[PDB]
Structure 1
Amino acid sequence: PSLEDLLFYTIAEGQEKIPVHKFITALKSTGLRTSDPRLKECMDMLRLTLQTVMLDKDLFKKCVQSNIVLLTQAFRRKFVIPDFMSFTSHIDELYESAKKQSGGKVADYIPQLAKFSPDLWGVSVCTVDGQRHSTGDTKVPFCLQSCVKPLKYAIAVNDLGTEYVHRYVGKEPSLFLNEDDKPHNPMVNAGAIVVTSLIKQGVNNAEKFDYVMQFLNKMAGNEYVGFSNATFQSERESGDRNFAIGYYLKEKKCFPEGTDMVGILDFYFQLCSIEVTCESASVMAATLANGGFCPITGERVLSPEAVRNTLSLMHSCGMYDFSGQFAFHVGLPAKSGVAGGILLVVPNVMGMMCWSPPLDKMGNSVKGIHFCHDLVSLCNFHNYDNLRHFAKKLDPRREG
């Protein structure tokens, strides 16, 4: 009748004792990792009883009681994708298939970007329940670049609301400005720079940057977030483009009262030069997918308003000149950047990061784009893809 007992019997298979490796394996095949923040108590307990292999009903109950709800959900098959092994097999195929696509040029406008190999290709999945999978180069760091644009937009809306933010920037797809003399949307450079000015006003750059990093940490569930000073230096050295825009926004009175624009550009470049991995960035995406809750910590990180707005803008303006085409064919909110990241959200299902340095003339990762098309081909995930009556296509949220 006890929860721990019920779970014990199901895992036990009628034996009297569960070998520790039998439970770990079973757990792993739900897609959870053993380093999941929410499973810390259980793993700490296992570490304890290991200092003294076989777990009886009472010893097991002692290890798992703190995390029984989550563990049951996993073992009952209540996660958003129940057959995660099958799903990861499919992800592996899509990865392999995109790997073959050798087209594209690596971004060479600064050394740091130009230094990355064309053969680097990673894909990471984090489910809204925290199920995690990776193939390829998922642990290498690289800079978010423009991929940071939704995240800081999220932050601004989180902190200030829709109304205040949208006083300063628009919300529709397109250096030039909209009808009302706002930049068109936070997904372009002009709008991003305006969004940059909004965040934590009245404290210095160092402080502001620390705030954004803490927030990024929560979104990633305390996985890898870093900073590239080198990238930062080269960006500031060579951003005549963004200097143009700043002076223009200044002239046109685009910033909030008492903005030091040159200082905001400096912040803006530091923001571009933040580093993630596939793995960490997928958690961030999963946060967006999960409604502002981090799927691995369980923390509320972003308001429902922040997340909805962000996904809306990722939809229509997220992939530079390919936005509209991407919305039509792929139908997922996403954002890319010049180091080859695409950050992809499949609302209520998962967050994804894809990384490959060579880009197409639109500015997007070749393999990343190829991968996203393939995903949507295979899976009902398109925004306007019916839940009942897909045509020929898989639904991973259905047992099979």
Structure 2
Amino acid sequence: PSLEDLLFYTIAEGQEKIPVHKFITALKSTGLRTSDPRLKECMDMLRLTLQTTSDGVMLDKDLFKKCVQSNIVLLTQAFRRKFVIPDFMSFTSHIDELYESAKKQSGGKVADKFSPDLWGVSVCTVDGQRHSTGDTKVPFCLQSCVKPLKYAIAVNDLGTEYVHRYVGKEPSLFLNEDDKPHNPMVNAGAIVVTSLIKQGVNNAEKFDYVMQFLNKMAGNEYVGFSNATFQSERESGDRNFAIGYYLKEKKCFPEGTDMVGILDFYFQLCSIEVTCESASVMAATLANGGFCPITGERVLSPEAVRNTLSLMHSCGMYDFSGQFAFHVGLPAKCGVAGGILLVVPNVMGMMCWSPPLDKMGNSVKGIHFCHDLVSLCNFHNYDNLRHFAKKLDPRREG
């Protein structure tokens, strides 16, 4: 018996007392962060114990048991290498290799304010393991990356049926044969989707509803808002105004939709800010069936998550979608600011961010990273989990 104690002899080398930093280094290598919310109680009790004790703060069996008894379940999984990527220490070295090789990719043209030398990669696994390399804490806008997220919110609140009364499920002209936009990843679809979220309420409260929803998936990491970007998208969004009026003409919005107001809302949502780190948790929530991996909170119905990953796969890269789903085989969404919201189902989320776009408007370093990643690891949607050639499988040991 004695769970908290089983752990205790695992981290102490058949010794009497664990040094506090040694437990912390043991914890940090599992990829978890000490700032992890599922660890607060443990980590508070740890700071308080350093506080009520002497300088050479060392934890005996009984004191270790006191701090860890509150989060022993997660702490046990973390230390028994039961997390989805057990040798997380090695995996992140490869993510570094992938980052550096993707960094030497110099091409591309920034949309038109940011520097073409920003290049950030954040990883968040379905179990909470974090890794980052490059400029991962800079705020940028989701832009078209918000489209999966707000479609998820719509489906989570209204169900696959209702949302898909107003938008289709097939890649793409503005409307398909049923006089609905083809799919919610294209602008015409996103605008109708935006017209479903929190109807009746006004755009100020709508925007807060989606803001708090994104906060839940980001594990309460940074979800911001660039009003500066908002002004530009609404001043030079002539293309979207075209879509808005056309949608209005073909009666695509729900009953009583203030079309010009839905467009302003829509311009706001494209202007929501994230960092690589915060958004990689958002991705990971989609990877994790709707449960935010660093909180354990259910944020999205599995219905909603499955749908969003589905359409991200078939419609998230626009015309490149067939090519991208062929070589990468991961659901992903792209953004003019240079972000790739990338989901490896059941394993992890990622955000890549390099502001230089390629000819198709996808961050060059992102796309190069995404290819490189699936080259290396058997994460392609149709790699075998048993016979995966010479690819490495992060999910296994030895």
Q: TM-score, normalised by structure 1?
A: 0.98
Give the distance between the partners of 2:125 and 2:28, measured in 1 at CA. 14
Q: Tell me, in whole angstroms, the C-alpha distance in 1 between the residues paired with 2:23 and 2:174.
A: 59
Q: Distance in 1 between matches of 2:315 and 2:360?
A: 13
Quick check: 1:83 aligned with 2:83? no
Partners of 1:98 and 1:17 in 2: how far apart?
44
1:399 is matched with 397
The reply to whether residue 12 of structure 1 matches residue 16 of structure 2 is no
**CA deviation digits over 1:110-165, x for unaligned, max 9?**
xxxxx200000000000000000000000000000000000000000000000000
SS state at 2:133 partner: strand
Deviations 1:6-32 (A, max 9, x none): 000111111111110000000000000
| Structure 1 position 320, deviation (Å) | 2.1
Q: How many equivalent residue pairs?
A: 394
- 8 A Cα contact 2:175 2:182, kept in partner: yes
Partners of 1:388 and 1:8 in 2: CA distance: 35
SS at match of 1:55: strand
In the TM superposition, what whole-angstrom CA distance separates every residue of 1:184-237 from its partner, at most 9, and x where no partner exists?
000000000000000000010000000000100000000000000010011100
* CA contact 1:320–1:363 (8 Å) conserved in 2: no
Q: Residues 320-339 of structure 1 correspond to what in structure 2 (within 5 A)?
A: 320-339=318-337
Contact 1:320/1:362, CA 8 A, preserved across alignment: no
The answer on whether the counterparts of 1:340 and 1:365 sit within 8 Å (CA) in structure 2 is: yes
| Cα deviation code 1:351-373 (max 9, x no counterpart) | 00000000111110100000000
Aligned-pair distance for 1:268? 0.1
Q: Is the 8 A contact 1:175 1:190 kept in 2?
A: no
Pairwise CA RMSD: 0.6
SS at match of 2:195: helix
The answer for unaligned runs of 5 or more in structure 1 is: 109-114
C-alpha distance in 2, partners of 1:387/1:308?
Answer: 20
CA distance in 2, matches of 1:296, 1:175: 41
Equivalent residue of 1:135, what SS? Answer: strand
CA contact (8 A) 2:171 2:318 kept: no
| Separation in 2, partners of 1:95, 1:85 | 16
Contact 1:175–1:245 at 8 Å: present in 2 too?
no
Q: Tell me, in whole angstroms, the C-alpha distance in 1 between the residues paired with 2:45 and 2:253.
A: 53
Identity %: 99
Task: Tell me the distance in 1 between the aligned counterparts of 2:23 and 2:384.
Answer: 37
Q: Distance in 2 between matches of 1:14 and 1:399?
A: 24
Instruction: Please list the CA deviations of residues 283-308 of structure 1 after superposition, one character each: whole Å capped at 9, or x if unmatched.
Output: 00000000000000000000000000
TM-score by length of structure 2 reads: 0.98
Distance 2:98 2:162 in 1: 41
Is 2:263 the counterpart of 1:259? no
Q: 1:156–1:165: 8 Å Cα contact kept in structure 2?
A: yes
**1:303-342: CA deviation from partner (whole Å, max 9, x where unpaired):** 0000000000000111122111000110000000000000
- Residue 58 of structure 1 and its aligned partner are, at CA, apart by 0.5
- The Cα of 1:175 is off from its aligned counterpart by 4.7
Is the 8 Å Cα contact of residues 228 and 275 (structure 1) preserved in structure 2?
yes
Compute the displacement of 1:176 (Å): 1.9
Q: How far off its partner does 1:243 sit?
A: 0.4
Q: Distance between the aligned counterparts of 2:35 and 2:106, measured in 1?
A: 35
- Alignment partner, residue 42 of structure 2: 42
Q: Given that residues 171 and 315 in structure 2 are in contact (C-alpha distance below 8 angstroms), is that contact kept between their aligned partners in structure 1?
A: yes
Contact 2:378/2:391, CA 8 A, preserved across alignment:
yes
| Secondary structure in structure 1 of the residue aligned to 2:340 | strand
1:123 paired residue number: 121
Mapped to 2, the partners of 1:375 and 1:172 lie a distance apart of: 27
Contact 1:106 1:118 in 2 (8 A): yes
Contact 2:314 2:325 in 1 (8 A): yes
